[PDB]
């Protein structure tokens, strides 16, 4: 818990770095990489420099490499003109060349190392593994050229249904009754049991017999049901139960419903009245018999065959497709990382990791947040030991929003309960210093909030040239953050979505009537600018509630987009529109298949049109016998320069530019175009590519090619984006209407508070629901945190007392079940005014509150 400089850091052992939300993250990793590039830094530094083919750094997006690469580039070329010319601009350089040693030396290493960047080792994991098992794959045994892989969804669909074949087929009608009623088809039972296929295996909770068969759990179910049937009707006849000040006279009932209970065995639900077994209710409505305490020992037990089925299963599924995957013998990310973590399992791992310490004597990692346990035993396996050799890790407790991603969290407090070097940035460069010291002190209201004792948030400082950020709104200046409250006792997600929802909208429409006369300003000091689209935005949740805020934003005629569809191309009337010309050009004989291509939208007739067209054979004959020839060009020249010319021939483009709104119909088209050429030239027959199209009509595959490209994304909008893609991306100011609302988990999925193991647990047990609670509330405060960034002049939100409870004035508020509640209530039911003192009580100067009204 210290802090950090790049110039002081002692580079040897094994360091963790902790850069908070808004540090950068690059300008720092860059000093290090120079540092380590050209050994200074004391005597704590390296004892040894290296060379650019010795330093591995490893990161997970795609994106980020190039980048990262292009400004490593950038500085070492301005840090070797600097140090040539001895005088530098950047206080970074200055102390380094303050720090050189020997410039010749120096300018003779960065000239020899700017040369050697083109192969520099930058790489993803599934990259930095698959180049190095194909350099050292003796030990693995694996084939040196494969075909990659990624619809391996299909497979496993194949594969689930081809063991409800074996498994379901031959079981008898009363055992495969109980089956029907939980779930009826495989497709079902692959969505069940799929979140759990991917990635690592977990353990599971009371595993059943080894050998267990269902017919077996079914006959044991049976004796346990069969026995307290039979021998209970021995005791029934007396009425040993005595009429207590609450004695009810319907335990008769209860006792007629087992005697009409107790004649077959056909079904499997036991009867509900067995409520008052409990042997305490005595005073309520002595045991004097055991069975009165066995039948709630029967009760206590659930019966079902889902905890077998589900592993029996789950097994041979990942067996099967691991098994099938070899005669074809082709690869995948899931299948390389563990045969990559089976070869360090096999007795040669001292071999294989001494020539990995050999060639790469160090190691960088970013985005650390996002990690496995098996990369995590790989990282420790190789870099636990061994000194001459460090390991630096950078990443950040918070912001890990990727827990359906294959990402744990508990894995990096793992690696921080070994590791015992911890430091903190400070600065932020972004927002405005009022908005760091209210993000500070609302954070700052109890300790250890994140429901951990290991995520300590510490305040951060501004930046002294941010101070003069003002946002004004006629004339005096404007609170950095606000809530917004609702009126009312109780209030339910409809109140919230319908006011909040209009009372955003108007005062997005305020301030965009505001701000296009020069009423309110955005200056660093005096020199300001108006506030337009681009600079407003907003953050939300999920999808569905989507529809809400853009029809209520485009009430008031504002235009908006919502950027965070991944919506495939194929979903739209374009795809039909071509489907329908291709057959029509290609069977151009009948009338009424012509006729349904030149009805369609693209050709831009009307009703006259097409009246004209019909009576006129001639005219009729001339469109008949163009697409003779078209059919013949088509023949001839493959996919392309067909759709090119009948684009060109009938001159649509100028009718979609001069109807309003045809640009996004337009540019679909051409994206069409450009997905058929991959499959134009690897198929020939027409009937394939006409058959292929509808084939991938009905199945909107989530390829990343397959989204929509971006009709204009030139000039300034209004954008709505969600949360998980708003990581790293700056807005001047922007919204958050939905943040009160929550959902509840339900799913049994936790891991120990001490293994830190992901254990799965088939019973339903109440505290390892309770510990997933814990952890899920723990996931939203991280989203709140990821959230509660990215605001350099403003931004603000609303709150509402929403109660989830059917009830409405008990006194027992359900807002603390939520993220923000806790931050307010800390653990109080409460109501209204317990809500608005709190409110008011930490409201100075910087936060301002305010009441809203259905407007």
Same mark, same amino acid.
């Given at each position: ?32 990489? /120079? ?13 040894? &420099? ?59 290493? /960065? ?163 067995? #409520?008052?077994?409990?042997?305490? #209710? ?63 399992? #096999? ?181 300001? *600018? ?64 012509? *006729? ?34 078209? *059919? ?32 996004? *119909? ?70 958050? &209407? ?38 899920? /509330? ?78």
């Amino acid at each position: 818990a210290e802090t950090l400089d790049p110039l002081r850091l002692p580079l040897q052992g094994e360091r963790l770095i902790e850069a908070s939300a808004g540090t950068g993250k690059t300008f720092t990793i860059a000093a290090l990489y /120079l540092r380590l590039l050209l050994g200074l830094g004391g005597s704590a530094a390296f004892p040894r &420099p290296l060379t650019v083919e010795e330093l591995l750094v490893v990161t997970f997006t795609e994106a980020a490499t190039a980048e990262l690469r292009g400004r490593i580039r950038s500085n070492i070329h301005e840090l070797r003109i600097a140090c040539l010319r001895e005088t530098t601009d950047n206080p970074l350089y200055e102390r380094l060349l303050e720090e050189i040693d020997d410039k010749a030396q120096a300018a003779q290493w /960065l000239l020899l190392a700017e040369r050697q960047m083109d192969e520099a080792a930058v790489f993803t994991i599934h990259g930095f593994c698959q180049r190095m098992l194909n350099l050292n794959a003796f030990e693995s045994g694996m084939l040196f050229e494969q075909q990659l892989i990624e619809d391996e969804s299909l497979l496993r669909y194949q594969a689930c249904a081809d063991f409800w074949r074996r498994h379901c087929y031959p079981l008898p009608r009363e055992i495969a009754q109980v089956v029907f009623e939980t779930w009826k088809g495989p497709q079902a039972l692959l969505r069940d049991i799929n979140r759990y296929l991917q990635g690592e295996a977990p353990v599971i909770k009371a595993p059943p017999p080894d050998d267990e068969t269902l017919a077996s759990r079914h006959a044991q179910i049976v004796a346990r049901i069969d026995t307290v049937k039979q021998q209970w009707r021995d005791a029934v006849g007396e009425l040993d139960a005595l009429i207590e000040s609450s004695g009810i006279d319907r335990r008769k009932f209860n006792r007629s419903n087992q005697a009409k209970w107790i004649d077959k065995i056909s079904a499997w639900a036991e009867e509900e009245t067995n #409520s008052y077994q409990l042997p305490e #209710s005595l005073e309520k409505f002595t045991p004097r018999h055991p069975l009165f305490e066995a039948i709630d020992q029967l009760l206590a037990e659930p019966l079902s065959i889902r905890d077998l089925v589900i592993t029996r299963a789950l097994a041979e599924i990942r067996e099967t497709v691991a098994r099938e995957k070899r005669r074809r013998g082709e690869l995948g990310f899931d299948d390389m990382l563990s045969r990559l973590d089976s070869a360090l399992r #096999s007795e040669s791992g001292e071999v294989l990791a001494a020539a990995i310490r050999t060639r790469f004597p160090v190691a960088m990692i970013d985005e650390f947040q996002d990690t496995d346990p098996q990369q995590y035993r790989i990282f420790r396996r190789i870099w636990h030991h061994q000194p001459e050799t460090a390991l630096l890790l950078i990443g950040d407790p918070k912001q890990a929003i990727y827990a359906f991603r294959g990402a744990d969290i508990f894995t990096y407090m793992k690696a921080r309960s070994e590791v015992h070097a911890h430091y903190t940035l400070d600065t932020n460069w972004r927002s405005a210093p009022g908005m760091v010291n209210s993000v500070n002190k609302l954070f700052s209201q109890t300790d250890d909030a994140f429901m951990f004792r290991e995520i300590p948030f510490i305040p951060v400082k501004s930046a002294g040239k941010n101070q003069a950020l003002r946002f004004v709104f006629k004339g005096e200046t404007q609170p950095a953050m606000k809530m917004w409250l609702m009126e009312g006792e109780s209030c339910g997600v409809g109140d919230y979505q319908s006011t909040m929802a209009q009372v955003c909208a108007a005062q997005i429409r305020d301030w965009l009537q505001a701000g296009q006369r020069g009423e309110a300003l955005l200056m660093n000091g005096d020199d300001a *600018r108006p506030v337009r689209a681009s600079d407003i935005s907003v953050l939300v949740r999920s999808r569905q509630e989507a529809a809400q805020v853009r029809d209520a934003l485009t009430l008031l005629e504002i235009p908006s987009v919502y950027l965070s569809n991944r919506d495939s191309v194929f979903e739209t009337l374009e795809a039909q529109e071509m489907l329908w010309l291709l057959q029509a050009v290609m069977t151009p004989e009948r009338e009424n298949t012509l *006729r349904s291509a030149l009805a369609t939208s693209m050709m831009g007739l009307n009703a006259l049109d097409i009246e004209t067209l019909n009576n006129d054979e001639h005219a009729w004959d001339v469109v008949v016998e163009e697409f003779d020839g078209y *059919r013949q060009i088509w023949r001839k020249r493959g996919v392309m320069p067909m759709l090119r010319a009948l684009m060109s021939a009938r001159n649509i483009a100028e009718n979609l530019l001069a109807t309003a709104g045809g640009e996004r *119909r337009l540019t679909d088209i051409l994206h069409i175009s450009e997905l058929l050429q991959e499959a134009g030239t690897q198929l020939e027959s027409e009937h394939a590519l006409v058959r292929w199209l509808s084939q991938h009509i009905l199945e909107p595959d989530s390829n990343a090619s397959s989204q929509q490209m971006r009709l204009e994304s030139d000039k300034h909008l209004v954008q709505i984006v969600t949360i998980h893609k708003s990581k790293g991306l700056e807005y001047p100011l922007v919204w958050l &209407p939905f943040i009160t609302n929550f959902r509840v988990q339900e799913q049994a999925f936790y891991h120990d508070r001490h293994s830190f193991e992901a254990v799965l647990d088939l019973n339903a047990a109440p505290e390892s629901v309770d510990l997933a609670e814990a952890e899920r /509330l723990a996931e939203d405060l991280r989203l709140l945190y990821v959230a509660l960034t990215r605001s350099v002049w403003h931004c603000s939100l609303g709150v509402a007392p929403l109660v989830r409870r059917r009830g409405d004035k008990k006194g027992d508020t359900d807002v603390h079940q939520s993220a923000l509640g806790r931050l307010l209530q800390k653990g109080e039911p409460q109501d209204a005014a317990g809500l608005r003192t709190c409110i008011e009580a930490l409201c100075d100067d910087d936060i301002a509150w305010q009441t809203a009204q259905t407007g």
